[PDB]
Amino acid sequence: LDDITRLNIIVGYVEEVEIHPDADTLYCLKINVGEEKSRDICSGLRLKKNSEDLLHKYVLVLANLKEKSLRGRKSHGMVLCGSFGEQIELLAPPDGVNVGERIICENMDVNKLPDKTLSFDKEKNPFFHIQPHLLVKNGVAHYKDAKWLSSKGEITCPLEQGTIS
């Protein structure tokens, strides 16, 4: 359960930001994560972020959550962020990353595949057990003491300290 190899965290390009008709606080995002079709992912950043803040960014998607249907709108995956006090910012890959690349920690075995699919029950979903150990420390993202890595270097967050959701 507390095993980060089980998460499939991948970089996507946010193609489109739209507001959710029936959800006051959700943007409806279209995010290319290397698949044949770009995915539809909801995000609860409507009250703390403007559209151009998200549009055309490279983001980190937890890809292996199961598709859900919120308020008429499908949402498959979620976009990862740093949070401190009242601020929330996106986690960012340095530029040059490819849609679809798996973001891994230091000393992690790339052959340790992530779960095909994570549970619907929060309590049986590695992510929420792992989450308390997911932090930004000095503007970098960490699992525990091990930094998150992309093909072009460590994952950054504009916040100095913070927690990952």
Automatic annotation (TrEMBL):
Keyword flag Ligase = yes
Q: Name one GO molecular function term.
A: tRNA binding
- Keyword annotations: Ligase, RNA-binding, tRNA-binding
> Transferase among the record's keywords?
no
Annotated TRNA-binding domain ranges read: 3-104
Q: Which domain of life is it from?
A: Eukaryota
Q: Name one cellular component (GO) term.
A: protein-containing complex
Protein name, entry field:
(malaria parasite P. vivax) hypothetical protein
Organism the protein comes from: Plasmodium vivax (malaria parasite P. vivax)
Instruction: Please indicate which part of the intact protein appears here, giving the first and last residue numbers and the full length.
Output: 241 to 405 of 405
